Amino acid sequence: KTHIDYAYELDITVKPDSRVPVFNREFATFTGAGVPLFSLGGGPIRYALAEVLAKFHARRGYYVVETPIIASTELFKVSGHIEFYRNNMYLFDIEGHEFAVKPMNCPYHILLFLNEVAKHRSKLPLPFKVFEFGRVHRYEPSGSIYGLLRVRGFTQDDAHIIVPGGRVIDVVYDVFEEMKLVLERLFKLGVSSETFKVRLSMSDKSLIGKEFMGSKEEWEGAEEALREAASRINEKYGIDIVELEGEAAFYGPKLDFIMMVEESGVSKEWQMGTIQFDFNLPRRFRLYDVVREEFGIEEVYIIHRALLGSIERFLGVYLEHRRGRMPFTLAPIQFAVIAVKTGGEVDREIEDLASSIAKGLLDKGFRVAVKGSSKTGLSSDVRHIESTAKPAVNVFIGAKEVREKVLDVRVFDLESMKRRRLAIAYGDAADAVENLAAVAEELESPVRSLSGQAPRIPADFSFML
Amino acid sequence: KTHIDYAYELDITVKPDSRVPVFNREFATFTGAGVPLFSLGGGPIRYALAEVLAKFHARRGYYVVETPIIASTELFKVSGHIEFYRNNMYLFDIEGHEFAVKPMNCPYHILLFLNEVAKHRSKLPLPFKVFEFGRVHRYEPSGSIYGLLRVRGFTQDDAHIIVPGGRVIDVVYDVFEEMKLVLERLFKLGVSSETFKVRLSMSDKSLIGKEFMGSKEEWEGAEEALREAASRINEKYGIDIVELEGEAAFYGPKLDFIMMVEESGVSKEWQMGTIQFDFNLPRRFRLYDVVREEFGIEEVYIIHRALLGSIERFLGVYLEHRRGRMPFTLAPIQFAVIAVKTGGEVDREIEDLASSIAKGLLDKGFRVAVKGSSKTGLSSDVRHIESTAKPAVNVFIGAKEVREKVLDVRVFDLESMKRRRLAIAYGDAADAVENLAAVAEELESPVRSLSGQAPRIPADFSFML
Ligand SMILES: [Zn+2]
Ligand SMILES: [Zn+2]
Numbered sequence: 001k002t003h004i005d006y007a008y009e010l011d012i013t014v015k016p017d018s019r020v021p022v023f024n025r026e027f028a029t030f031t032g033a034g035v036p037l038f039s040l041g042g043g044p045i046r047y048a049l050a051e052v053l054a055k056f057h058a059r060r061g062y063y064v065v066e067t068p069i070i071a072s073t074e075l076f077k078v079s080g081h082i083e084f085y086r087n088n089m090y091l092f093d094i095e096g097h098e099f100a101v102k103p104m105n106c107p108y109h110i111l112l113f114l115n116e117v118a119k120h121r122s123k124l125p126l127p128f129k130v131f132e133f134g135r136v137h138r139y140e141p142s143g144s145i146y147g148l149l150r151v152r153g154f155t156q157d158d159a160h161i162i163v164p165g166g167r168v169i170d171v172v173y174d175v176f177e178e179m180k181l182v183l184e185r186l187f188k189l190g191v192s193s194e195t196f197k198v199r200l201s202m203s204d205k206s207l208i209g210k211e212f213m214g215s216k217e218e219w220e221g222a223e224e225a226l227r228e229a230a231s232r233i234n235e236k237y238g239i240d241i242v243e244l245e246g247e248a249a250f251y252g253p254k255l256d257f258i259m260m261v262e263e264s265g266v267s268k269e270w271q272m273g274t275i276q277f278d279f280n281l282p283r284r285f286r287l288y289d290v291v292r293e294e295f296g297i298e299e300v301y302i303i304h305r306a307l308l309g310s311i312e313r314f315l316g317v318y319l320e321h322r323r324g325r326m327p328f329t330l331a332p333i334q335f336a337v338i339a340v341k342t343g344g345e346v347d348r349e350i351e352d353l354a355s356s357i358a359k360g361l362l363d364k365g366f367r368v369a370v371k372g373s374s375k376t377g378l379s380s381d382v383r384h385i386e387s388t389a390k391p392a393v394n395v396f397i398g399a400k401e402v403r404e405k406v407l408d409v410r411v412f413d414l415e416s417m418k419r420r421r422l423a424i425a426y427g428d429a430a431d432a433v434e435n436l437a438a439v440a441e442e443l444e445s446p447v448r449s450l451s452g453q454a455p456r457i458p459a460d461f462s463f464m465l
Numbered sequence: 466k467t468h469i470d471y472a473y474e475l476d477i478t479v480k481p482d483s484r485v486p487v488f489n490r491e492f493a494t495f496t497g498a499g500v501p502l503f504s505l506g507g508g509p510i511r512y513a514l515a516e517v518l519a520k521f522h523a524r525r526g527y528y529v530v531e532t533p534i535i536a537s538t539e540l541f542k543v544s545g546h547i548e549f550y551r552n553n554m555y556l557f558d559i560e561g562h563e564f565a566v567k568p569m570n571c572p573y574h575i576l577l578f579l580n581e582v583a584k585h586r587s588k589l590p591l592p593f594k595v596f597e598f599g600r601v602h603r604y605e606p607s608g609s610i611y612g613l614l615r616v617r618g619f620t621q622d623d624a625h626i627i628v629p630g631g632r633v634i635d636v637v638y639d640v641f642e643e644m645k646l647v648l649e650r651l652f653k654l655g656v657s658s659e660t661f662k663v664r665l666s667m668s669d670k671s672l673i674g675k676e677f678m679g680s681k682e683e684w685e686g687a688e689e690a691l692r693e694a695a696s697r698i699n700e701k702y703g704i705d706i707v708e709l710e711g712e713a714a715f716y717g718p719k720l721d722f723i724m725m726v727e728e729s730g731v732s733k734e735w736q737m738g739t740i741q742f743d744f745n746l747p748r749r750f751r752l753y754d755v756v757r758e759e760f761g762i763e764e765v766y767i768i769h770r771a772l773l774g775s776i777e778r779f780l781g782v783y784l785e786h787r788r789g790r791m792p793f794t795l796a797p798i799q800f801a802v803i804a805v806k807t808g809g810e811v812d813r814e815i816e817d818l819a820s821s822i823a824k825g826l827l828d829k830g831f832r833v834a835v836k837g838s839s840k841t842g843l844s845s846d847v848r849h850i851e852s853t854a855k856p857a858v859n860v861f862i863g864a865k866e867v868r869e870k871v872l873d874v875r876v877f878d879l880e881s882m883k884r885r886r887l888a889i890a891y892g893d894a895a896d897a898v899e900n901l902a903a904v905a906e907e908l909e910s911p912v913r914s915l916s917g918q919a920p921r922i923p924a925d926f927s928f929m930l
Binding site for chain 1: 500507529566606
């Protein structure tokens with residue numbers, strides 16, 4: 001089972017090679033290869049993700065933005081190289097004039113910086129931090145496409161930071177702290193000395209001015225910002241730091257976030273976001289000039305950063321590491337309500353309890369699926385539910401639950417990777433809904449500390465069970 | 466003053482003909498004409514909008530989805546005509562194979578329906594309703610582009626409904642009820658007999674089979690669904706109904722939502738969303754077959770619907786009708802905190818009060834701008850603030866406010882189009898923040914009834930004041 005299997009079973013995506021009813025052709029022969037089609041289970045995940053990440057960034061001091069999907073290629077000529085990158089771009093004509101589907105958000109985020117400087121000049125505070133849940137499209141050959149990992153259109157938790165020399169170490173460190181908060185609180189992935197690695201990729205000093213563009217001073221101030229920040233990370237968490245000479249991009253050094261995972265029992269890297277300096281963009285968009293003239297700052301850095309990286313890719317690898325098991329806030333089905341029918345007259349109270357709880361949870365904004373089951377059917381029904389839909393919480397309502405006034409509620413524990421039984425007392429349907437909503441709020445708590453609000457995007461997914 | 470002026474002054478957009486610092490070229494010569502670039506003030510509006518509309522639709526029974534931005538042209542060949550619509554499409558090549566930037570979400574939403582039928586068959590409930598905050602791109606000639614009204618890339622509150630004959634009148638009516646809830650609660654625009662018109666566009670019966678495709682039966686069942694629904698609308702609200710013979714699309718009849726507005730004092734239509742039947746798509750994607758075979762339903766309808774329509778266009782016309790005055794939830798600056806300094810020692814308590822209130826409002830997730838003003842500067846500072854930034858709420862903190870322990874708080878009243886003064890007592894900074902947050906929650910209340918949650922996407926926009 002790969003993420004292609006989990007994504008399909010959880011209905012996060014449509015499988016490219018599933019056959020379209022009546023056409024008996026594959027979904028991929030309508031959509032094209034490497035264009036992930038998010039389905040009904042995946043839709044609420046995408047809105048929840050944008051909203052949580054946007055709000056998380058706004059609370060940490062980033063301006064949230066949305067930039068156009070297309071642009072004149074003048075935009076990418078200025079940025080540019082163009083002769084090279086042109087080749088990874090989807091290009092088209094309006095009206096003699098060359099346009100591209102955006103492959104990166106950077107030039108747009110810089111124009112937004114430039115517009116604010118023109119309007120407000122030095123009243124604009126530095127560091128200037130801009131975040132976008134951004135949608136980018138890039139050429140990939142057919143043989144390179146794989147699931148959600150390598151695709152033609154995808155999403156980044158992208159941000160750009162323009163930070164003076166006096167604050168750059170803190171900014172680098174803070175981005176690490178942001179990455180950790182998102183992993184731990186949104187995804188429930190522990191970030192510690194045993195699970196995490198920070199890798200720095202630096203210049204070869206003998207090659208500055210040639211394969212590494214820019215000045216010695218730029219490279220030294222940037223590499224030294226990464227070393228101090230990484231030294232604070234290691235001091236604080238005992239997280240180990242790896243430095244690779246000569247591995248930086250031509251336009252600046254970087255730091256990569258790397259989770260260490262184990263099979264099976266093989267130790268494997270899971271690469272996530274990056275912090276990437278850029279000596280090219282401040283030259284091409286005249287940012288060094290603009291900052292010097294308007295702010296009187298001579299030492300300034302331009303940073304590209306993501307925490308997750310590609311969201312599709314992140315999600316792909318997540319589905320594998322966690323065997324289809326989503327955190328409560330991101331689970332296609334949040335509460336599965338399972339009515340264990342008996343054949344006897346108690347089935348009426350069971351049916352009314354299940355149905356009322358389901359309605360009440362939907363009204364609180366939760367994603368709910370009701371399953372009609374039976375004493376003899378239960379074991380096989382549950383097994384299907386676990387091997388396919390993997391609801392965040394199972395609520396079992398049988399004769400015993402009705403007579404004893406205690407729900408049998410099974411939350412899936414992401415650390416132990418097991419269901420955990422809770423006994424939830426209730427007086428009636430409404431009281432049961434309140435109590436189930438309390439369990440949910442506890443599961444939502446870490447996401448509230450990131451974004452202020454946990455997203456409630458309700459859906460009735462009963463048809464899936 | 467047009468929406469181009471308001472959008473720029475509120476920093477909702479970058480002005481195409483603003484000059485880029487140092488390049489002294491126009492922003493439009495990097496972006497291309499008719500590609501709206503949303504700026505820092507516009508970013509939170511876009512995320513808030515997606516989130517509110519998505520959640521509103523999920524609570525009303527729509528599945529929320531996000532579909533790809535690109536597609537093989539096979540997708541649009543099936544839908545199709547293609548020979549015609551090809552001409553409004555941005556087309557590009559991967560790897561010998563023709564792709565398009567999506568001009569409409571419809572075919573993707575139908576594939577998602579088709580995938581769920583293949584997986585779950587008749588367990589999928591009807592009506593099937595799917596909503597998307599969707600991003601579409603269409604060819605427009607340079608001479609056709611105007612502000613936010615007619616552009617090359619834009620957003621729709623798009624949905625598709627597959628509804629059996631037994632439920633179609635109710636679905637039509639409900640979409641009207643959805644449109645009214647969004648206008649009134651999100652936008653504070655009254656929908657009544659005096660402000661609103663419903664226009665139906667129908668076949669010419671003599672032309673069915675020729676300029677109007679499909680069968681008599683289809684057209685009659687659809688036109689009659691619109692007449693009954695419209696008759697319920699008129700019965701309930703006294704809203705008047707206009708019917709135009711021969712004005713339908715070739716593929717089905719429709720209803721348009723039309724607000725009536727007055728200048729100046731000229732009566733003008735403001736066209737919003739549409740409810741559009743389609744006899745083409747169920748043939749091209751074999752939906753009539755699929756529904757008949759899997760659900761045993763012979764009478765079924767396919768509907769395209771939006772409430773606002775183009776969101777950019779809606780927003781453009783809104784900014785004009787309301788002279789730059791956004792509802793609280795959507796205002797770039799939610800609280801402007803204005804410190805009226807005196808020159809004397811009370812300035813310290815004023816500065817600490819303003820600063821603490823600002824911080825406290827930011828921590829609640831609000832969009833805040835602090836302005837340092839003075840007794841003699843106030844009148845001109847306020848005038849600049851009103852003519853430019855138009856904050857949802859002004860909080861004036863001077864010597865009097867500090868000594869009397871009562872804030873001077875001015876909410877902008879969208880109906881009367883005037884500031885309205887409130888006297889907000891406080892004991893200290895924290896208590897003031899709580900009380901200001903209470904005023905905000907009252908202003909957020911209508912948006913909570915739509916979406917469960919009002920969006921808090923914080924920002925410090927002090928630099929704008
Ligand atoms: Zn970048
Ligand atoms: Zn449509």
